């Protein structure tokens, strides 16, 4: 039986539990920096397009 | 004529194996999957209205073995219903297995299995971040072109029982009415700015008031009050999105009114994060199933 069509949302508090510091604050900052560095896709959009352009022109 | 039961069977054959074992489908099967799924996407709404119960997953980024871990935990289709939030390809080693299994399940259970579009389901990112190279190494450029056409037709957002809004990225400064989503025509590429860009690119930010600059260099950040106003205005309870690796697989924002889900543990051999999947039961009670990082 399908669920495509075309009450209140709650949290399972016991599930959430079951899943500050100068060391932990440092660990968080390192992660945030790693993540910022990793997400660089915005830098290469133009190049990606120029690559799609000229490979189209091969035909 | 395309044998879906065979394709699923062969893709699932590697279930017990050492991570990284390839499944080699024939070229014509892969493009069979693309052409048939494209049809199903175009035939269903661009803004999905869905009923609970269902499992919601975030980014997977070619981590096929981890996708199999998710189904093991949540139950293989059709034991459970699934909504994925996008970003199936790139970054990982096995984009093709990942997308093929997902597209196969979409074709076999078109009303119990759902895929949204992520920012990596777009040629402007695909060319560069692994998928194209995968396609050209194992098949040819032409196959990548076929996937592009399929991706261009993916739905963009979902509302679960009128209470949970789901998209890959987040809100848009241009999102005033749900009808604005419904109006987007497919097939379509992702524009450099505007509503469709934002839905796939934006991020929540603790330190921002209203709408701010995004470090990605595309789209925006939004603050907690923005999330609060949106839920209030459209009479919703929760925003569910993906798009950013988080350490525990999931992370709350704005007093639990938004949650970020990320389903790839040990993300691309560069992080040691958990992956999470969210379970939504019939009463909309939400719980989290974690894939812990390797030890």
UniProtKB/Swiss-Prot annotation, chain A:
Bias-annotated ranges (Basic and acidic residues): 22-33
Superkingdom as given in the UniProt entry: Eukaryota
Residue segments, region Required for binding PPP1CC catalytic center, displacing metal ions and inhibition of PPP1CC catalytic activity: 38-41
Modified residues annotated as Phosphoserine in this record: 8, 21
Description of post-translational modifications: Phosphorylation on Ser-8 by ATM activates PP1 by dissociating the PP1-PPP1R2 complex.
Annotated segments matching region Required for binding the 'RVXF' binding groove of PPP1CC: 7-19
Annotated stretches, region: Required for binding PPP1CC: 1-6
Disulfide bonding pattern of the chain: none
Assembly mode: Heterodimer with PP1.
Protein function: Inhibitor of protein-phosphatase 1.
Family from the record: Belongs to the protein phosphatase inhibitor 2 family.
Protein name listed in UniProt: Protein phosphatase inhibitor 2
Origin species: Mus musculus (Mouse)
Upper lineage: Eukaryota, Metazoa, Chordata, Craniata, Vertebrata
UniProtKB/Swiss-Prot annotation, chain B:
EC number: 3.1.3.16
Coiled coil stretches, renumbered: none
Chief location: cytoplasm
Keyword check for Iron: no
Active-site residue numbers: 120
Subunit structure: PP1 comprises a catalytic subunit, PPP1CA, PPP1CB or PPP1CC, which is folded into its native form by inhibitor 2 and glycogen synthetase kinase 3, and then complexed to one or several targeting or regulatory subunits. PPP1R12A, PPP1R12B and PPP1R12C mediate binding to myosin. PPP1R3A (in skeletal muscle), PPP1R3B (in sliver), PPP1R3C, PPP1R3D and PPP1R3F (in brain) mediate binding to glycogen. PPP1R15A and PPP1R15B mediate binding to EIF2S1. Part of a complex containing PPP1R15B, PP1 and NCK1/2. Interacts with PPP1R3B, PPP1R7 and CDCA2. Isoform 2 interacts with SPZ1.
Family as reported in the entry's similarity comment: Belongs to the PPP phosphatase family. PP-1 subfamily.
Described purpose of this protein according to its UniProt entry: Protein phosphatase that associates with over 200 regulatory proteins to form highly specific holoenzymes which dephosphorylate hundreds of biological targets. Protein phosphatase 1 (PP1) is essential for cell division, and participates in the regulation of glycogen metabolism, muscle contractility and protein synthesis. Dephosphorylates RPS6KB1. Involved in regulation of ionic conductances and long-term synaptic plasticity. May play an important role in dephosphorylating substrates such as the postsynaptic density-associated Ca(2+)/calmodulin dependent protein kinase II.
Protein name (database record): Serine/threonine-protein phosphatase PP1-gamma catalytic subunit
